[PDB]
Amino acid sequence: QYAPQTQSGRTSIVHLFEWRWVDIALECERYLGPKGFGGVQVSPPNENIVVTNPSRPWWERYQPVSYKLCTRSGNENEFRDMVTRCNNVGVRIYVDAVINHMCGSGAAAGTGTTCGSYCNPGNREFPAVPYSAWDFNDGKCKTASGGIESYNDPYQVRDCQLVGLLDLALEKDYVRSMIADYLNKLIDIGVAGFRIDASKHMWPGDIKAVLDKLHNLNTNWFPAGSRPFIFQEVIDLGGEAIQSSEYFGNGRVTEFKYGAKLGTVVRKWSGEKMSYLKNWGEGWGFMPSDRALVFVDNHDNQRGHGAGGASILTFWDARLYKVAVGFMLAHPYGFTRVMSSYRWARNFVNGQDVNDWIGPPNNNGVIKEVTINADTTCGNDWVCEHRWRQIRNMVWFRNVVDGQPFANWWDNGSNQVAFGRGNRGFIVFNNDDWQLSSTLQTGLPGGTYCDVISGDKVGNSCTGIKVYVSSDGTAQFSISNSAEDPFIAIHAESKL
Ligand SMILES: OC[C@H]1O[C@H](OC[C@H]2O[C@H](O[C@H]3[C@H](O)[C@@H](O)[C@@H](O[C@H]4[C@H](O)[C@@H](O)[C@H](O)O[C@@H]4CO)O[C@@H]3CO)[C@H](O)[C@@H](O)[C@@H]2O[C@H]2O[C@H](CO)[C@@H](O[C@H]3O[C@H](CO)[C@@H](O)[C@H](O)[C@H]3O)[C@H](O)[C@H]2O)[C@H](O)[C@@H](O)[C@@H]1O
Ligand SMILES: OC[C@H]1O[C@H](O[C@H]2[C@H](O)[C@@H](O)[C@@H](O[C@H]3[C@H](O)[C@@H](O)[C@@H](O[C@H]4[C@H](O)[C@@H](O)[C@@H](O)O[C@@H]4CO)O[C@@H]3CO)O[C@@H]2CO)[C@H](O)[C@@H](O)[C@@H]1O
Ligand SMILES: OC[C@H]1O[C@@H](O)[C@H](O)[C@@H](O)[C@@H]1O
Ligand SMILES: [Ca+2]
Ligand SMILES: [Cl-]
């Protein structure tokens, strides 16, 4: 449950949010495999309700109508093909499992669904599953409205309707079994694990009863007896009635404190300074590292009013975002997820983006292909953060240093900091309003190393900055506060 089941030596996964299956299959072969990425989190592959107002928002995919593999991302054959092709080049697939709920109780009866299944939400009728009224928590929820009226009552949070979505009666074996049958189909196709959407809104024990029914992973690609990787989306920033620790027995848990706190520090809000990161990890009150899934932003909070609010860093804040992602990927805490986004027209009305609904790049509702430019960037308004040099190379850094302890911390008492990972990597940041020019102990063997932030190692040369490390392990680092990327990273495989 806790082990990611990635190929040995691969330590991150990337969220290819709203990507089509054919494009992911390609990306696996041409890019993710060769560049050392461990896996891909995909958008929900099951049939969802079509929302015409607003027009085809990203969030319609969090409103299931059946477990047919038929969505704007593709059909079943395309899904299967993607899973086979990615696994064959060493890149795992993790599915976003939406299992707390079906679609909104107020949606109209009809075949306005991505595969044309019929449903009647007002009658709690989903014949393509099938579910009926006795399969939902209407009778269990104790609130007048039927929704969640207070988050300090765990019963409401779990048994009542989250934003009007029909809440499945997860204590029933029939419902557990229908969900296990869906997940097991996906496991047998070859998926390696699951993000469990909205885990806070389920009882830990009901999730457990579902997980206990799940097949071992497909032995074409995995060792016998392998269990699916589970990570559960529980938003817990502290001082709530439900805690992330209630879910430790099922798998890993999203640690939303991580991005919220890191964003605040990198931005230097609320008195925070990079030097306070000396004890980052359990030292800041985070869950145990072996239970954590971490990330700087996710698909919801990158829109600015989710867990962490305005402090969350994103591709819109490119320069500081790269700093935060860099720090994350260098630091030993947790298992790391990298985000990959699309661009949308933000429109702020009283500190609120009213276009936060907008779905992926599309032609009249049909998702656009991901095009690759000569310079290796993406077109068609896909951001492709995972292809930015600074991020891809820090993904490799994490692979190279995997297993090495945190070591050789230095700081200037403010926002210049550095640390290493055993004797295989070192990274230095300047987030202060003045120059960094200091000779630091790196822990690395003497030699000449390419900085993998400003460039790459190509044959027996570096395309960016080079760092000469003395025989005693020291080197001089000079970073202006006006540097494009105000940090430098060197590792064992960037050595000339
Ligand atoms: O009821 C039919 C209804 O269907 C549509 O959707 C309704 C609501 O869905 C959308 O919300 C999406 C979230 O923005 C998105 O973040 C995600 O949610 C995930 C969340 O971020 C994450 O943390 C987590 O753990 O999982 C969540 C889901 O997986 O996906 C969401 C669902 O698609 C809209 O953004 C949201 O605002 C819509 O809600 C609006 O209408 C509903 C229903 O009236 C309101 O609920 C309230 O009124 C009800 C009246 O009885 C009451 O029962 C309920 O308890 C009240 O809370 C809601 O507050 C309001 O904003 C269409 O949007 C809608 O037009 C259709 O009628
Ligand atoms: O200008 C501000 C607002 O405009 C945008 O939303 C639009 C939609 O995109 C339009 O198509 C239209 O909505 C239609 C809708 O397409 C149609 O289905 C119907 O709605 C049904 C609904 O589907 C059904 O599930 C049930 O609940 O009953 C509804 C019937 O009332 O009728 C709609 C029009 O009444 O209009 C809206 C404009 O409000 C924009 O995306 C919004 O974000 C924005 O607020
Ligand atoms: O299985 C765990 C159980 O926790 C209980 O507190 C809930 O009331 C029940 O619905 C759930 O099944
Ligand atoms: Ca629930
Ligand atoms: Cl998440």
UniProtKB/Swiss-Prot annotation:
It catalyses: Endohydrolysis of (1->4)-alpha-D-glucosidic linkages in polysaccharides containing three or more (1->4)-alpha-linked D-glucose units. GO terms for molecular function: alpha-amylase activity; calcium ion binding; chloride ion binding. Pfam families: Alpha-amylase (PF00128), Alpha-amylase_C (PF02806). Disulfide bonds join C28-C86, C70-C115, C141-C160, C378-C384, C450-C462. Its EC number is 3.2.1.1. The keyword Calcium applies. The active site is at D197, E233. Glycans are attached at N412. Ca(2+) binds at N100, R158, D167, H201. The keyword Disulfide bond applies. Its cofactor is Ca(2+); chloride. It is found in: Secreted, Extracellular space. Chloride binds at R195, N298, R337. Binds 1 Ca(2+) ion per subunit. Binds 1 Cl(-) ion per subunit. Keywords: Calcium, Carbohydrate metabolism, Chloride, Disulfide bond, Glycoprotein, Glycosidase, Hydrolase, Metal-binding, Pyrrolidone carboxylic acid, Secreted, Signal. Its main location: secreted. It is an enzyme of class 3 (hydrolase). PANTHER family: ALPHA-AMYLASE (PTHR43447). The two forms of this enzyme, I and II, show very similar activities, molecular masses, and compositions and differ only in their isoelectric points. As no evidence for two variants were in the cDNA library of PubMed:10082956, it is most likely that isoform I (PPAI) and isoform II (PPAII) are two forms of the same protein. Binds to the sea anemone inhibitor helianthamide and magnificamide. This is Pancreatic alpha-amylase. It comes from Sus scrofa. The gene is AMY2.
